[PDB]
Amino acid sequence: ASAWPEEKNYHQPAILNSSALRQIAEGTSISEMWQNDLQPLLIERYPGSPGSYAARQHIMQRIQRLQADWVLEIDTFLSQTPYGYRSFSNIISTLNPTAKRHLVLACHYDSKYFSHWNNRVFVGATDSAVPCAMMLELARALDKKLLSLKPDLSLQLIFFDGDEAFLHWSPQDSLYGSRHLAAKMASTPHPPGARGTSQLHGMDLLVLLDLIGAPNPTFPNFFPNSARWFERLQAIEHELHELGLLKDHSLEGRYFQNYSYGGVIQDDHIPFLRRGVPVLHLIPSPFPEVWHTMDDNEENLDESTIDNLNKILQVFVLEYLHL
Numbered sequence: 001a002s003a004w005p006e007e008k009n010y011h012q013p014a015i016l017n018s019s020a021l022r023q024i025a026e027g028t029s030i031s032e033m034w035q036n037d038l039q040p041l042l043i044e045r046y047p048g049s050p051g052s053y054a055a056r057q058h059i060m061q062r063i064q065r066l067q068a069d070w071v072l073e074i075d076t077f078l079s080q081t082p083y084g085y086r087s088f089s090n091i092i093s094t095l096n097p098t099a100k101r102h103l104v105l106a107c108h109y110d111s112k113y114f115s116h117w118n119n120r121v122f123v124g125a126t127d128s129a130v131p132c133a134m135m136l137e138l139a140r141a142l143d144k145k146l147l148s149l150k151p152d153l154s155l156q157l158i159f160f161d162g163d164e165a166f167l168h169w170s171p172q173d174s175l176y177g178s179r180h181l182a183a184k185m186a187s188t189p190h191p192p193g194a195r196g197t198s199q200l201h202g203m204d205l206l207v208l209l210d211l212i213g214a215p216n217p218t219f220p221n222f223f224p225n226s227a228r229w230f231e232r233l234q235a236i237e238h239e240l241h242e243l244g245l246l247k248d249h250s251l252e253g254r255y256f257q258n259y260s261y262g263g264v265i266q267d268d269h270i271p272f273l274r275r276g277v278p279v280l281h282l283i284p285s286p287f288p289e290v291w292h293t294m295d296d297n298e299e300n301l302d303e304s305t306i307d308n309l310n311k312i313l314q315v316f317v318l319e320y321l322h323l
């Protein structure tokens with residue numbers, strides 16, 4: 001009986017030196033992400049809407065154009081909702097599908113439903129169009145390094161549909177795509193042919209990005225079983241800062257601070273966390289001031305903060321994958 005699902009407990013990063021850090025800082029482009037990955041998503045995209053379809057095609061197209069060997073799957077299913085039965089479609093993009101272990105980055109691509117109000121439309125810029133765009137920019141910026149994966153460990157991206165409640169949050173009206181996918185992964189043997197291990201056992205760590213893009217975010221260290229990875233984000237932020245590789249950034253105003261949070265924040269990691277998957281929850285506390293208002297738009301995003309977080313996340317991912 002293999003102990004491979006315990007490998008994630010001892011897994012250590014291969015830390016980048018200064019020269020490599022400067023290279024990663026220079027290899028991501030916030031303006032290219034803005035134009036090519038983010039703006040096409042700043043549209044109404046609640047589940048089942050025309051915008052949902054457009055957002056899903058955009059995400060698939062941007063991944064498909066890359067050199068790395070991404071395998072795209074659309075996980076479509078039905079769920080009861082306050083409005084009756086509806087269909088939802090999660091997007092999963094995976095490098096090395098048969099690799100036993102994957103580091104998983106995720107966010108939700110649906111936007112919360114709101115009837116148009118005084119001609120304004122909710123596009124959920126921080127929630128979570130930016131997180132989607134950060135994942136797409138990370139795939140683009142690290143494409144040459146990721147192509148080399150073509151340590152039985154690789155990378156997977158998940159874009160959840162139906163994170164938002166159709167009304168106000170309730171246990172049955174929220175997290176449609178993640179409750180469905182977590183259950184599906186928990187009941188799918190992995191690697192193919194396995195007798196007793198599932199796709200969830202293969203999830204080394206679920207890094208969930210949510211509500212990112214406002215000024216001065218502070219991310220709490222939520223869980224003890226991922227605290228050492230939260231510490232790595234702190235260290236990466238500190239070193240990128242010291243090397244002069246971040247913009248409009250100070251250590252007093254750092255994003256990863258030393259502080260936990262006792263409470264529970266309901267989000268797409270919950271169905272995974274309750275089935276034993278380690279989670280690194282990159283959601284700020286407090287939430288952006290524009291949360292769930294028509295002001296959660298492009299004008300209120302903080303460009304340099306998103307750029308700095310792209311650098312930090314890309315270094316974290318390369319160090320985890322030893323690339």
Ligand SMILES: [Zn+2]
Pocket residue numbers: 112127164292
């Ligand atoms: Zn929301």
